[PDB]
Paper text:
Here we used a pair of thermophilic/mesophilic acylphosphatases homologues (acylphosphatase from hyperthermophilic archaeon Pyrococcus horikoshii (PhAcP) and [name] (HuAcP)) as a model to study how local flexibility of the active site affects the enzymatic activity. Despite remarkable conservation of sequence and structure at the active site, the catalytic activity of the thermophilic PhAcP is significantly poorer as compared with its mesophilic homologue HuAcP at low temperatures. The salt-bridge between the active-site residue Arg-20 and the C-terminal carboxyl group is found only in thermophilic PhAcP but not in mesophilic HuAcP.
Two variants of HuAcP were constructed. Secondly, a pseudo-wild-type HuAcP (HuA99) was created by replacing the C-terminal residue with an alanine residue to resemble PhG91A. Crystal structures of HuA99 and HuG99, resolved at 1.5 Å and 1.7 Å, respectively, demonstrated that they were superimposable with a Cα r.m.s.d. value of 0.17 Å. In a good agreement with our original design, the salt-bridge between the C-terminal carboxyl group of Gly-99 and Arg-23 at the active site was only detected in HuG99, but not in the pseudo-wild-type HuA99. Regarding the Arrhenius plot, both HuG99 and HuA99 exhibited straight lines that intersected also roughly at 298 K. The salt-bridge bearing variant HuG99 illustrated a steeper slope of the Arrhenius plot, i.e. a stronger temperature dependency of the enzymatic activity, as compared to that of HuA99 lacking the salt-bridge. Importantly, the activation energy (52.5±2.5 kJmol−1) for HuG99 was analogous to that for PhWT (49.1±1.4 kJmol−1), while the activation energy for HuA99 (29.5±1.9 kJmol−1) and HuWT (37.6±3.1 kJmol−1) was comparable to that for PhG91A (32.1±1.7 kJmol−1). On the other hand, the distance was ∼6 Å throughout the simulation of PhG91A and HuA99, suggesting the salt-bridge was broken. In contrast, despite the mtm180° rotamer conformation, transitions to ptt180°, ttp180°, and mtt180° rotamers were prominent in the MD trajectories of PhG91A and HuA99. For instance, the thermophilic PhG91A is consistently less active than the mesophilic HuA99 although both enzymes lack the active-site salt-bridge. While the two enzymes have similar values of activation enthalpy (i.e. similar slope in the Arrhenius plot), the differences in enzymatic activity are a result of PhG91A having a more negative value of activation entropy.
Numbering used by the authors: 4 to 98
The structure:
């Protein structure tokens, strides 16, 4: 009953706009676990883990919406993989 993990990195106007707060909220709403963090190249990165359909909904959110004041240029997804079990028990803002 298939769980996946995927890494993400979001490019655009994504800092100074409460991106991490909104990402955590949306991930939790979708029953996802993982994490979100700001990077030193100005992007937002993290991992998403959960059922495929929920992860995919979140991937879409990360492509077009993000936080209200944000302007997303590109969401890069990497290392999509099936997992035996969740590696996380919550969705953390790493900060």
């Amino acid at each position: 009953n298939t769980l996946i993990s995927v890494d993400y990195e979001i490019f655009g106007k994504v800092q100074g706009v409460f991106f991490r707060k909104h990402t955590q909220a949306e991930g939790k709403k979708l029953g996802l676990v993982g994490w979100v963090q700001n990077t030193d190249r100005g992007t937002v990165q993290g991992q998403l883990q959960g059922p495929i359909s929920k992860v995919r909904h979140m991937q879409e959110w990360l492509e077009t919406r993000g936080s209200p004041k944000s302007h997303i240029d590109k969401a890069n997804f990497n290392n999509e993989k099936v997992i035996l079990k969740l590696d996380y028990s919550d969705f953390q803002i790493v900060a």
